Design an enzyme around this catalytic site. Structure first.
Site, PDB file in Angstrom:
ATOM      1  N   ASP A 176      -5.167  -6.114  10.658  1.00 46.80           N
ATOM      2  CA  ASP A 176      -6.503  -5.486  10.697  1.00 46.80           C
ATOM      3  C   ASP A 176      -7.668  -6.445  10.432  1.00 46.80           C
ATOM      4  O   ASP A 176      -8.741  -6.270  11.006  1.00 46.80           O
ATOM      5  CB  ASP A 176      -6.612  -4.226   9.799  1.00 46.80           C
ATOM      6  CG  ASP A 176      -6.173  -4.452   8.360  1.00 46.80           C
ATOM      7  OD1 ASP A 176      -6.343  -3.527   7.535  1.00 46.80           O
ATOM      8  OD2 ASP A 176      -5.656  -5.520   8.025  1.00 46.80           O
ATOM      9  N   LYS A 184       0.796  -1.234   0.000  1.00 50.95           N
ATOM     10  CA  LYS A 184       0.000   0.000   0.000  1.00 50.95           C
ATOM     11  C   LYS A 184       0.830   1.287   0.000  1.00 50.95           C
ATOM     12  O   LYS A 184       0.419   2.288   0.576  1.00 50.95           O
ATOM     13  CB  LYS A 184      -1.011   0.037   1.170  1.00 50.95           C
ATOM     14  CG  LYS A 184      -2.015  -1.139   1.231  1.00 50.95           C
ATOM     15  CD  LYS A 184      -2.775  -1.175   2.558  1.00 50.95           C
ATOM     16  CE  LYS A 184      -1.899  -1.670   3.709  1.00 50.95           C
ATOM     17  NZ  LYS A 184      -2.720  -2.197   4.853  1.00 50.95           N
TER      18      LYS A 184
HETATM   19  O1  LIG Z   1      -5.400  -3.134   5.195  1.00 49.09           O
HETATM   20  C1  LIG Z   1      -5.901  -4.241   4.449  1.00 49.09           C
HETATM   21  C2  LIG Z   1      -4.745  -5.065   3.874  1.00 49.09           C
HETATM   22  O2  LIG Z   1      -3.905  -4.241   3.024  1.00 49.09           O
HETATM   23  C3  LIG Z   1      -2.811  -5.054   2.635  1.00 49.09           C
HETATM   24  O3  LIG Z   1      -3.187  -5.953   1.620  1.00 49.09           O
HETATM   25  C4  LIG Z   1      -1.798  -5.694   3.608  1.00 49.09           C
HETATM   26  O4  LIG Z   1      -0.852  -6.490   2.952  1.00 49.09           O
HETATM   27  C5  LIG Z   1      -2.684  -6.530   4.561  1.00 49.09           C
HETATM   28  O5  LIG Z   1      -2.009  -6.926   5.748  1.00 49.09           O
HETATM   29  C6  LIG Z   1      -3.958  -5.774   4.998  1.00 49.09           C
HETATM   30  O6  LIG Z   1      -4.772  -6.663   5.767  1.00 49.09           O
END
Ligand SMILES: OC[C@H]1O[C@H](O)[C@H](O)[C@@H](O)[C@@H]1O
Ligand SMILES: [K+]
EC number: 2.7.1.1
Length: 453
Positions: free
Chosen positions: A201, A165
């Site tokens: 998360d 991200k």
């Molecule tokens: O925030 C939502 C997701 O974004 C990304 O894909 C991260 O790699 C993952 O850990 C997370 O759960």
């Protein structure tokens, strides 16, 4: 000419038909996902698997628990959130309640500088929060929602596999994230914290939904990023010792497609988004879905349409040609339009455009195409997990609850509805209840911390 506006719209439709996925396409994606999930769980294929199926050490029987004051941290978006949450004994188990909260924007140079800068900033924010609430120095149990792929040795220890991200802070990958946090707190030296738990998360979200629904054994995020966790049978989690009960597994399904599994479905716009991203070639399934990418996908579609002379008289404004300028919230707002084109008009006007009526309608169709593909692609992932679970378990009809958080799922007017319908088509013999978490990451982090504490 109404005839020539209609002709423009038929051409737009031909271009936009490329985003369609048929039920059989989705079944193919679903089966592929399930295959990668199997591969991620097995010792033999884990390192090769694009879908990592990371053990969280969050178990079905968390023995006991604890009450009192808990601090929760949430890092995973453009914003870092600190909150004080109270965990206490209820009639079903532990309730948790957000009481004091503060959010901080992360400076650009902290997300792409060094891990020292990033974690110094985080420590500064924790100080500021403890100041505003006089809960300083003192020692509190700290739960860390840290929304990136981590290989756990336990609930309180795990290494960052790789940033996602847009995160790029040097010196963090391959290191213990809790360690990086403790180190930075110690360098500042103006408070002391008991770092007790680190969770994804998705996991925080699943956990936060339990007190209200004990059938919640899936957590899903459709926000900036896209990911899911679920309660796997311990006998199928080959990377951890033991066959009894269940452990939460972080799929990291966002990396699905990173070994070529989505190649036949990727469009030019997807290739362009990937190539101008911070992590080219990675998180390709997430890039079809997540809010970090959705608006940009729409911007690129609109640029193709202007280049075809089908939109805005074939001229694109400076703002429309600016990276990230079509925000993902504009996608939701456009699809919120009641028919009078007012919402759409005002978005495109603030982007320096002079839209006509049909321009507005075409932009709506462009948004619907991108967001519907996102909904459908996401559905194939969730269906794969839930179908997996049903088979692993002893179930003719599996009744399960999914706990969900993220701005795309929560705030998009029709994503949710299109997503549910597609997931239901792919999951016969399952009864799936969806629940939106309220402060899922903050309360989840506290509850896991209570168990680990
Ligand atoms: O925030 C939502 C997701 O974004 C990304 O894909 C991260 O790699 C993952 O850990 C997370 O759960
Ligand atoms: K095992």
């Amino acid at each position: 000419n109404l005839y020539f506006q209609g002709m423009k719209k038929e051409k737009v439709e031909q271009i936009l038909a490329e985003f369609q996925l048929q039920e059989e396409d989705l079944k193919k994606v679903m089966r592929r996902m399930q295959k990668e999930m199997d591969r991620g769980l097995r010792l033999e294929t884990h390192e090769e698997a694009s879908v990592k199926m990371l053990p969280t050490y969050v178990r079905s029987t968390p023995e006991g628990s604890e009450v009192g004051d808990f601090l929760s941290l949430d890092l995973g978006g453009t914003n870092f959130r600190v909150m004080l949450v109270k965990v206490g004994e209820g009639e079903e188990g532990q309730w948790s309640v957000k009481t004091k909260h503060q959010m901080y924007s992360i400076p650009e140079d902290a997300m792409t500088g060094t891990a020292e800068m990033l974690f110094d900033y985080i420590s500064e924010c924790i100080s500021d929060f403890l100041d505003k609430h006089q809960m300083k120095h003192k020692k509190l149990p700290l739960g860390f929602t840290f929304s990136f792929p981590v290989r756990h040795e336990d609930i309180d220890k795990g290494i960052l596999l790789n940033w996602t991200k847009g995160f790029k802070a040097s010196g963090a990958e391959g290191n213990n994230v809790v360690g990086l946090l403790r180190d930075a707190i110690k360098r500042r030296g103006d408070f002391e914290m008991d770092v007790v738990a680190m969770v994804n998360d998705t996991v925080a979200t699943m956990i936060s939904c339990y007190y209200e629904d004990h059938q919640c054994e899936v957590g899903m995020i459709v926000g900036t990023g896209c990911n899911a966790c679920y309660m796997e049978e311990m006998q199928n989690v080959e990377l951890v010792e033991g066959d009894e009960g269940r452990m939460c597994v972080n799929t990291e399904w966002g990396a699905f497609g990173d070994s070529g599994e989505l190649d036949e479905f990727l469009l030019e716009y997807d290739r362009l988004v990937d190539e101008s991203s911070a992590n080219p070639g990675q998180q390709l399934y997430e890039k079809l879905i997540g809010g970090k990418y959705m608006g940009e996908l729409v911007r690129l579609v609109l640029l193709r349409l202007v280049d075809e002379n089908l939109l805005f008289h074939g001229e694109a404004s400076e703002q429309l040609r600016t990276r990230g300028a079509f925000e993902t919230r504009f996608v939701s707002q456009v699809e919120s339009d009641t028919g009078d084109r007012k919402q759409i008009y005002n978005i495109l006007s603030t982007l320096g455009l002079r839209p006509s009526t049909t321009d507005c309608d075409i932009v709506r169709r462009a948004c619907e195409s991108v967001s519907t593909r996102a909904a459908h692609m996401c559905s194939a992932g969730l269906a794969g997990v839930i179908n997996r679970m049903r088979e692993s378990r002893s179930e003719d009809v599996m009744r399960i609850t999914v706990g969900v958080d993220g701005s795309v799922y929560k705030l998009h007017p029709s994503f949710k509805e299109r997503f549910h319908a597609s997931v239901r088509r792919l999951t016969p013999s399952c009864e799936i209840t969806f629940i939106e978490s309220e402060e899922g990451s903050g309360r989840g982090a506290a509850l896991v911390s209570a168990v680990a504490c």
